[PDB]
Amino acid sequence: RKLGYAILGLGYYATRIIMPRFAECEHSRLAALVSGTPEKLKTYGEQYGIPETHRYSYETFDRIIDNPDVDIVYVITPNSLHRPFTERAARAGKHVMCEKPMANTVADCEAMIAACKKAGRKLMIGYRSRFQAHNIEAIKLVRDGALGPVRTVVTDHGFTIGDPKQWRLNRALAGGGSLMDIGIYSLNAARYLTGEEPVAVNAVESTDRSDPRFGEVEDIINFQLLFPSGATANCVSAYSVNCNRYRVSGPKGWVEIDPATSYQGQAMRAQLGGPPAPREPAPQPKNQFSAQLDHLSECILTGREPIVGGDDGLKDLRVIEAIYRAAREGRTVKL
């Protein structure tokens, strides 16, 4: 039994990463395409055997309500378009998978959650790392007490962004700079490794406004989190260096992954009793992308809630607003 996905926004992530991974799914299938580029509907429609009756533009998208082969709409557009396409998908009676970051603001996330609730449809955010073997192993080591109580999480995410004209460097479409796009991985990991929500936030921003890339959004914004248990996080978010890693540490030892949240190539190292050494995670039956897709399908089929629902996305946006505020006001912001 497989639920049908409509993929909306046929860009790099949709076409290079997500659509090929339906091949390993057990409860999900590609059923429809939604695009603002007629040429893409033809190319990918022909490639994946999607009939013309199942190809939509953004103008005809609302007609998808009459297509019973579509159960889920997966929104993979620029960030500022997540809310209106999610709302339209909910009004078309479809369940929704929405890419991170959920939306530009807390208020926008709340609107999305309300729309899906009103429709009685499920909502999930594309935090694929929660289905990735090494990440699952790090969470397990923490929960099983192998580190003792978490004391520090040190995590850095960044890449050297290029073309100044791309939507990520356009405030109207991206909603912000590095923190919205890649810094969110540091924040999301701080939260799922501690299993807590932060109560205090520091931040420092640093952007060269003479750089042609950074006229509108931020380059570096680094932040500190304090959690109720006393756990702490030091996080890097950057558009001008390459990094992808975290280490979580307690009095009994530590575990790190570098790269941590990449598409592939994860490598884990741990210091648990003895000297630092590589550590293999427990095997997972499916890659992180197929696992994410099937998780939503399986939740709908069994009447359960996604482990990374709209509330997880909303909680990230709450802290993101606090981080921007702490950097603007130069003070510790309380949550």
Ligand X SMILES: NC(=O)C1=CN([C@@H]2O[C@H](COP(=O)(O)OP(=O)(O)OC[C@H]3O[C@@H](n4cnc5c(N)ncnc54)[C@H](OP(=O)(O)O)[C@@H]3O)[C@@H](O)[C@H]2O)C=CC1
Ligand Y SMILES: OC[C@@H](O)[C@@H](O)[C@H](O)[C@@H](O)CO
Number of neighbours of residue 286 by Cβ within 10 angstroms: 17
Any contact of residue 12 with ligand X (CB under 6 A)?
yes
Q: Which is nearer to ligand Y, 200 or 271 (CB)?
A: 271
Choose among a copy of itself, ligand Y, ligand X, none what residue 81 binds, the Cβ cut-off being 5 to 8 Å by kind. Answer: ligand X
Choose among a copy of itself, ligand Y, ligand X, none what residue 37 binds, the Cβ cut-off being 5 to 8 Å by kind. Answer: ligand X
Q: Which is nearer to ligand Y, 232 or 261 (CB)?
A: 261
Q: Which is nearer to ligand X, 171 or 272 (CB)?
A: 171
Choose among ligand X, a copy of itself, ligand Y, none what residue 122 binds, the Cβ cut-off being 5 to 8 Å by kind. Answer: ligand Y
**How many binding residues for ligand Y (CB under 6 A)?**
26
What lies within 8 Å, CB to CB, of 183 at 6+ separation is: 157, 158, 221, 223, 235, 236, 237, 238
The C-alpha atoms of residue 75 and residue 330 are separated, in whole angstroms, by: 35
Query: How far is the CA of 76 from the CAs of 103, 205, 222, in angstroms?
Result: 12, 28, 26
For residue 321, the surrounding DSSP H or E stretch is helix 310-329
In the shown chain, the binding pattern of residues 202 to 241 toward a copy of itself, with x for contact by CB under 8 A and - for none, equals xxx-xxx-----------x-x-x-x---xxx-xxx-x-xx
Contact 129, 112 (CB under 8 A): no
Identify the active-site residue in 44, 56, 74, 100: 100
Any contact of residue 152 with a copy of itself (CB under 8 A)?
yes
Phi-psi region of 57 (alpha: psi -120 to 50; beta: other; left: phi over 0): beta
Any contact of residue 181 with ligand X (CB under 6 A)?
yes
The C-alpha atoms of residue 56 and residue 37 are separated, in whole angstroms, by: 10
What does residue 85 show for φ and ψ, rounded to 5 degrees? Answer: -70, -35
Among 106, 134, 119, CA closest to 318:
106
- Taking the complex as a whole, how short is the minimal distance between the CB of residue 65 and ligand Y, in angstroms? 8
For residue 319, the surrounding DSSP H or E stretch is helix 310-329
Query: Which residues of this chain interact with ligand Y, rule CB under 6 A?
Result: 71, 93-95, 113, 116-117, 120-123, 159, 181-182, 266-268, 278, 280, 300-301, 305-306, 309-311
Q: By CB under 8 A, name the binding residues for a copy of itself.
A: 151-152, 154, 156, 158, 160, 200, 202-204, 206-208, 220, 222, 224, 226, 230-232, 234-236, 238, 240-243, 247, 249-251, 253-254, 271, 330-332
Give the catalytic positions in this structure. 100, 185
